[PDB]
Write a protein that binds this ligand. Structure first.
Ligand SMILES: CCCCCCCCCCCC(=O)OC[C@H](COP(=O)(O)OCC[N+](C)(C)C)OC(=O)CCCCCCCCCCC
Ligand SMILES: CCCCCCCCCCCC(=O)OC[C@H](COP(=O)(O)OCC[N+](C)(C)C)OC(=O)CCCCCCCCCCC
Ligand SMILES: CCCCCCCCCCCC(=O)OC[C@H](COP(=O)(O)OCC[N+](C)(C)C)OC(=O)CCCCCCCCCCC
Ligand SMILES: CCCCCCCCCCCC(=O)OC[C@H](COP(=O)(O)OCC[N+](C)(C)C)OC(=O)CCCCCCCCCCC
Ligand SMILES: CCCCCCCCCCCC(=O)OC[C@H](COP(=O)(O)OCC[N+](C)(C)C)OC(=O)CCCCCCCCCCC
Ligand SMILES: [Cl-]
Ligand SMILES: [Cl-]
Ligand SMILES: [Cl-]
Ligand SMILES: [Cl-]
Ligand SMILES: [Cl-]
Ligand SMILES: [Cl-]
Ligand SMILES: [Cl-]
Ligand code: NA
Ligand code: NA
Ligand code: NA
Ligand code: NA
Ligand code: NA
Ligand code: NA
Lengths: 311, 311, 311, 311, 311
């Protein structure tokens, strides 16, 4: 089989569409997501023209091996898509209507800067390479782009699924390539992070600040060191759900900052004990009373500054 | 091969049945389950009819490639089902009886609101897309819907496996689609959660309340902070077995509430120590004695309120 | 190809055998095991009979596609077995000898009631469905049932591999089905559980009982709360190696009971401190001295009761 | 195609060779390793003999389907090997030279008795089953047994890759079977275990012995119980990298023994406190001073005994 | 099909190129990475030569089965590459242009000596085995070596993708083999290691040094033992992200050294308490005051020495 011949000199236009059936396994660490969808393709092949009078039928049904089919691939997939042809319908003028159902693991980078209050634009890049006989170009049939109402991505809200209608046509290894960008816009469901990580992390921090109403050094050491260890556990828990980034994330910034608060609280508890032992408790009392106001105030202002820098 | 032609203008009715052989791997985080079952299909193909008295044969056995077979798919599967055709039988009037054994990973959302005392309705959606020649509609043969007695889903009780007999007929990408909903009703075996998570979590909380019968600040700090850390470990353990939800689960609510009890217990232990240091122990004694009643009473009433809101 | 015709009205007997080559990956949580074995099949096909003299051959070899082969399946497998035909030999009377080597992941429920001192009976269920032409029944050729001497299942002792010679014949989707039960009897190697979990768990418990020879409340709180946390770690470790069961396991029972001992030890440590503060140490001394005997005695008797109920 | 006929009554000798290209994923828990290698086969087929003078060709190249090829399998593999035929060459006398590149997951038991100072002999068992026409026997062509210089198994040193030249010929399911044993000798790189597990474990143990230079019961309880918990963490870490064995490993023995040292240290700390409270500190001083020598001395001698029993 | 015949006695030159489309899953423990790329091949086959005037075409498009294609393999892959042929084009003089898109998991050793400030050279080794008929040699077409601008390897910076133009020609099982080395140079994004592991590890160490401003033995024991346990947690966390190496890594060296600092801090805290109890506090004061300077100074100098030895 060979490509359809041009009537004049034009490129062959392959109309495309993606209809999402299932979205699952958005893996933050791997920066992948799995998709189950319909891929629709349409092109004119006049060599397949027929008379409904002679053949009896108004539409011809073909097997993929029987006719020429454009070699359409995905750019950002781990392995080639698992595809099953649903239908190949040829109309009397030779217009082919191809429909396949596929499943694929898509690699799409994620911006974790505002995590867990982040939004993402996932991409599915469709591509075709031109052949010697003819140049092939891709187009979007907007009537065949969409998603099932039941499409749910656990832990995310699906906003939209649209296609950039203009393909990116470029030269690659001395041949033309036609690339389409299908965009799935999603926003993270931050809800569960509040009772599971944010509030527990704030509770243990506020518990360490009870040391500013205690003169007992041994109890103070226990309060600040124990809550610090619990903070380390939350830091480790959070970093297991995330990849290593060459930038600070919002959560990462807060988690890092809270270490500084634990470090300065240990200094305060040490300074307080040292002065008490040196028979200077009046002074220790001034530092401890100031700390009761300074620690929550600096914590609030530092969080306002961080929220401002990130949002 | 082409679809069987209509005698009048009627859609082709494909009778379906699913008989469960195995149920395994209900993954709560992934919201998937694996299934091994029989899929039965039945439709009339008049082009295949034969005489019973002339032929001598009551039934004719065909290979899948020899005859037309409807393209039946599952909506909510990760990848296409792994299927092996078992038998194809044709009756004299041309009634085809198709049987395949398949295995599939099914995506079906779970409602964790009442976890671990939750019940679920798992779905297996059967679908067929109509052809240009004619419309294909699905039906349920209740005689061919069921499950093996030995079907066990580890950690769950299987209640029923039924089908919604009326299909959901709708247009998708300019062709009719006929969808059937097979429902597997299950209820979680909550038993093991009681000795492994619920009672250990209650024991450590009650151990923190022994601080209300102690005047030793240093021992009190050790009691409340150590048990809090053990509570954090249980919180982390529980959240590893569950996906992130945009709602509170019953267990999540109790786990979150128990933090408030630890936080107020730390305030009480701090207030008690502060007053004793300020030579006001009579008062500290009033707060500590009130706490002995208030903490278990507010804990009981808050749990009655939560159980009422969730069940 | 069609099934061999009956001389009278008899069912077709397919003689079976399973010879285990490899046993691996017994997954307790998943209740699965992987198997690599020979599957042997034997039946009479009159249509393939020959005379040895005029043929010059005592045996005839065929390709699977050339002749009729019974559709033998496994009931309790995740996916269909990976099989490769080794040999197909036909004797003069048309007796077919089929041999395949296969690998499969088998689902077989496990009884964890006596864990880690438990024994199991793993099952491999062989099945065949009848055809309209004739009833197909399974039999066991005991001469072709066995296992390689080197077959080892890591963490288990293999006792026997036998077959229940009488098949379970029953109707399924209006056709008769013939099922054979191959049983692999195994017993768990409990050895490693003694130095890794049982003795460490006993050591930390006995360490908490040193609080009955101490009047220091602060030290006592540290002894009982620290060892309790280590007990929680062992509880979590044990429950990660096991599925959730709607019953108590032997280890689960002991682990749960040990919490009660920690809870009562905290009450004792609290009561002791309370009385000392109330200037009643003579009394506290009576409770502490009684506890030194009561705790190990009640622990021994409770363990004798538990061992009796479970074994 | 059928096997080459015997000139007299001799068995068909299939000469074999395995050339390792890659070794990876030695999984201690699973007792598996992955291999990527060349498999070379050689046998005489007189039916393929030709004249080199008149043919003008020294060698003929065939496709696997064109000629008879012996069914060679691996005994100890999870699934059948993934193989790609590289070349088939026939010499004028009819000697066939077969070469394939394969990849396989091999099951090979490991002896953990001396872990992490252990050495292993990994096995790759080659097998052939005799056909009805004639008996097939395996041989080793030492000229075609080897490994690439770059073959590296992460965490191990590769010593040798040799074959036991005499096959194990035996009857299995009324046929002959010819088995070859390919041995890959490896020794574990114990280096990293010293700074990561052994020395940290010794440091925390020696830290618990500082309690023999302290009269503070509260500090002593904290020293011995905290380091014990850290020892439990190392015990858990070590047992996650290993399967459960029906014998003691060297590391397992040391880890278990160190619990006894923690248990006796708690007794000593308890006895010391008890005597001080009973106004017998002179005596407590004698036990504590003896403990300073006894604990390191008994620890050294017990380790010499253990090293002797294991090496 | 057979290889192109030599005009004189020359080896057949196969020109190669690799164009990277995707780079993902660099697994440090496994020492693997996944790649999705174009593989281009070019060679002269005179038997395929044609006259452009006579044929009426300037290029000829074949199917892989229709013509001879060199058996090109990757040396350092887990399994054979997943490949799909994109195009085969023949010029009038018989110059074949082959293009395939492939995906593979590549084995490539990593040097962890400078981790997490390390750089790596990943290798993709292309290989061809000669045939009896002629010798096959590989070459690099630099015009067909490259990478897509969007190629990103999570946690790494991609520096260059080049090929060593001179192949490594050698004998393997009496046949010539021609090997090409494609090199992907990468450098680790160490950024996230600073707020997540390095600074938290320094903070807990500096917190242990507050014991040099405290005379409270019980508080000191709590400070040094608690922070040591947190250091053990970081040691375990770090070693889970890395394979076991027969050498010290930079991070491993620092982590190991920090144990020595904890060990000597415990000795100091013990010596200080012992002297106080022995009524020698003036002396204890001299050791504690010296420790305040000695510990940070020796820590800084030891780190300068380590950084010098490693970089
Ligand atoms: C410890 C610090 C506590 C965390 C503070 C909340 C983070 C924040 O400030 O969150 C802000 C995000 C909203 O983000 P948005 O509209 O997506 O951003 C895009 C914004 N533009 C378009 C203007 C640039 O979430 C919320 O609605 C806040 C609800 C969470 C409350 C948590 C309480 C604890
Ligand atoms: C800490 C708080 C303690 C937990 C309290 C039990 C939770 C609960 O209230 O559980 C309730 C569920 C019953 O659920 P149901 O009939 O399926 O609900 C559907 C209800 N409709 C149809 C009326 C809407 O379980 C039980 O049978 C209780 C047994 C668990 C005891 C645990 C003791 C500890
Ligand atoms: C904490 C309490 C310590 C645990 C006590 C052992 C459990 C037990 O009693 O184990 C019993 C099992 C034996 O069981 P069996 O013959 O398979 O049972 C079938 C019994 N019928 C046929 C009579 C019904 O193991 C043993 O050989 C005991 C050795 C373990 C010693 C552990 C010491 C610590
Ligand atoms: C805590 C106890 C400390 C561990 C003691 C080392 C174990 C041992 O004794 O190790 C011995 C093995 C050597 O073994 P080999 O020659 O392979 O054995 C075969 C022996 N035959 C042929 C004689 C039977 O390792 C070593 O080279 C020791 C280096 C490790 C030092 C660890 C310091 C900490
Ligand atoms: C505890 C001690 C703190 C660790 C100190 C940093 C390690 C280091 O010294 O890192 C040095 C590397 C630079 O390495 P380079 O140029 O790739 O090496 C090749 C060198 N040649 C070509 C000369 C051989 O990173 C940096 O730029 C330092 C940034 C990290 C700061 C961490 C602050 C905490
Ligand atoms: Cl693709
Ligand atoms: Cl499907
Ligand atoms: Cl099967
Ligand atoms: Cl094999
Ligand atoms: Cl390859
Ligand atoms: Cl050489
Ligand atoms: Cl050569
Ligand atoms: Na085609
Ligand atoms: Na068909
Ligand atoms: Na303490
Ligand atoms: Na057949
Ligand atoms: Na063959
Ligand atoms: Na070819």
């Amino acid at each position: 089989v060979s490509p359809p011949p041009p009537i004049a000199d034009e490129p062959l236009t392959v109309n495309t569409g993606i209809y999402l059936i299932e979205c699952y396994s958005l893996d933050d660490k791997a920066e992948t997501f799995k998709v189950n969808a319909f891929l629709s393709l349409s092109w004119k092949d006049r060599r397949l023209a027929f008379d409904p009078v002679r053949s009896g039928v108004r539409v011809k049904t073909y097997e993929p091996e029987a006719i020429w089919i454009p070699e359409i691939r995905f750019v950002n997939v781990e392995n080639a898509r698992d595809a099953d042809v649903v239908d190949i319908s040829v109309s009397p003028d030779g217009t082919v209507q191809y429909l396949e159902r596929f499943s694929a693991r898509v690699l799409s980078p994620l911006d974790f800067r505002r995590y867990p209050f982040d939004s993402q634009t996932l991409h599915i890049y469709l591509i075709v390479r031109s052949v010697d006989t003819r140049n092939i170009v891709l187009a979007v049939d907007l009537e065949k782009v969409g998603k099932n109402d039941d499409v749910f991505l656990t832990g995310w809200d699906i906003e939209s699924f649209t296609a950039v209608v203009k393909p990116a046509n470029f030269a690659l290894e001395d041949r033309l390539e036609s690339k389409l960008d299908y965009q799935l816009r999603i926003s993270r469901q931050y809800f569960s992070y509040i009772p599971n990580i944010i509030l527990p992390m704030l509770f243990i921090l506020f518990i360490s600040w009870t040391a500013f109403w205690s003169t007992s050094y041994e109890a103070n050491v226990t309060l600040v060191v124990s809550t610090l260890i619990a903070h380390i556990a939350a830091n480790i828990l959070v970093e297991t759900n995330l990849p290593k980034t060459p930038y600070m994330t919002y959560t990462g910034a807060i988690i890092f900052m809270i270490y500084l608060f634990y470090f300065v609280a240990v200094i305060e508890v040490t300074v307080q004990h040292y002065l008490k032992v040196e028979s200077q408790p009046a002074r220790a009392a001034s530092i401890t009373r100031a700390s009761r106001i300074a620690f929550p105030v600096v914590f609030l202002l530092a969080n306002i500054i961080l929220a401002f820098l990130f949002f």
